Amino acid sequence: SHMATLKVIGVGGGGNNAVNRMIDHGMNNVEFIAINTDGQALNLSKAESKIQIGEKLTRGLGAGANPEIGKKAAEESREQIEDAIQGADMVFVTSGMGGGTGTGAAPVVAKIAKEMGALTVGVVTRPFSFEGRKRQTQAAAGVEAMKAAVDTLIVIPNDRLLDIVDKSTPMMEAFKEADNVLRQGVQGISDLIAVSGEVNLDFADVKTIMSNQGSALMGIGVSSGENRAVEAAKKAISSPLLETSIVGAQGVLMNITGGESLSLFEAQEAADIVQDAADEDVNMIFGTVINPELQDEIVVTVIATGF
Ligand SMILES: Nc1nc2c(ncn2[C@@H]2O[C@H](COP(=O)(O)OP(=O)(O)O)[C@@H](O)[C@H]2O)c(=O)[nH]1
Ligand code: NA
Numbered sequence: 346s347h348m349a350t351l352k353v354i355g356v357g358g359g360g361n362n363a364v365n366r367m368i369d370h371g372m373n374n375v376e377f378i379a380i381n382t383d384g385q386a387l388n389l390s391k392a393e394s395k396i397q398i399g400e401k402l403t404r405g406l407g408a409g410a411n412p413e414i415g416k417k418a419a420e421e422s423r424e425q426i427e428d429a430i431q432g433a434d435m436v437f438v439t440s441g442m443g444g445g446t447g448t449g450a451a452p453v454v455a456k457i458a459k460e461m462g463a464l465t466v467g468v469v470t471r472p473f474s475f476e477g478r479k480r481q482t483q484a485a486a487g488v489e490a491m492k493a494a495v496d497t498l499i500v501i502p503n504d505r506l507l508d509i510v511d512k513s514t515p516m517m518e519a520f521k522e523a524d525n526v527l528r529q530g531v532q533g534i535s536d537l538i539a540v541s542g543e544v545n546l547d548f549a550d551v552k553t554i555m556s557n558q559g560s561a562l563m564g565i566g567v568s569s570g571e572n573r574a575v576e577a578a579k580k581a582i583s584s585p586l587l588e589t590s591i592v593g594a595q596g597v598l599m600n601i602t603g604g605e606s607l608s609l610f611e612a613q614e615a616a617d618i619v620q621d622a623a624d625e626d627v628n629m630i631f632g633t634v635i636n637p638e639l640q641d642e643i644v645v646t647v648i649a650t651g652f
Contacts, residue, residue, distance in 0.1 A: 350433050351531060352376045353377050353437045354379075354454055356381070357382075360380075366520070377392040380419075382399045399418025414446070414449060415446040418450060434463060436463040437531060442487040465495045466499070469498070469499070497558045497561035505587075506522065506523060533648075542634035558651065560589040562587055563648050566645045568580065568642070569641045573641070575618055577645040579618060591647075592623060593623065594623040595652070596630075597627045598649075599630070601615055603634075604640055612631075
């Protein structure tokens with residue numbers, strides 16, 4: 346009856362890098378919008394919809410690390426941004442904080458989406474410490490601005506990438522790991538919408554957990570064999586890349602997908618992992634999907650808010 350329209354918007358260089366790598370990976374039923382001052386980068390964007398902002402301000406260059414330029418470029422193009430969003434039920438705005446375009450334009454894009462009624466989720470990075478204190482300070486101002494403009498915000502400090510690489514891991518492979526946070530969040534919501542689960546969750550449940558909330562965690566875990574439900578739930582709530590951990594979550598959207606062997610006992614085990622890890626009484630919105638194609642595998646999806 347209702348088919349929710351999801352859009353992913355990349356703002357500035359890193360945000361548009363994320364959009365390009367996600368399109369390359371493959372994502373059906375999601376629409377991508379690339380927003381940048383940098384016309385050279387936009388010409389290389391794989392996104393179906395591209396918006397060059399601030400051409401008269403920047404003559405087609407980036408914003409040169411000045412967030413005021415990004416902010417003015419986005420406001421001067423509000424109509425174009427609204428046209429690109431129109432029809433969206435949910436908008437993911439992804440951006441690297443600390444530069445000129447993302448820091449200044451991403452909060453404007455999010456505000457536009459929110460006042461179009463879209464469930465608006467920000468997924469943003471903080472700069473590496475080696476990029477210096479000014480960049481960290483600019484980024485912090487952009488994070489605060491994003492928080493004021495979105496329904497829910499996921500922050501990925503780039504410094505956490507240094508916790509998951511070895512000395513040889515290519516930087517592009519590290520960036521793909523940060524990409525997965527957004528990509529797997531979008532996909533879990535897309536999967537939730539597409540299927541009528543045995544205990545069904547739908548977009549209105551996503552809205553209940555994410556609307557007007559603040560910090561969020563999105564995660565997915567997949568496991569097989571003995572103890573699969575516990576292991577998958579631990580993976581879903583344990584990202585080394587997130588600023589916001591599960592601890593102190595008070596609302597959780599949790600979906601469990603399994604084959605016909607999905608037992609009541611292990612659904613409780615998985616739910617209990619999330620309750621006990623949050624260390625709070627969690628308002629859980631719980632769903633289950635029996636996908637008989639799956640054999641021994643189980644999938645746990647978690648969206649946590651209420652901090
Ligand atoms: N994780 C990740 N971070 C990025 C990427 N590109 C840029 N960044 C970070 O994002 C910050 C802003 O850079 P960028 O998006 O290119 O600046 P902007 O285009 O002016 O908004 C940089 O300081 C880096 O910390 C990326 O592809 N992945
Ligand atoms: Na569903």
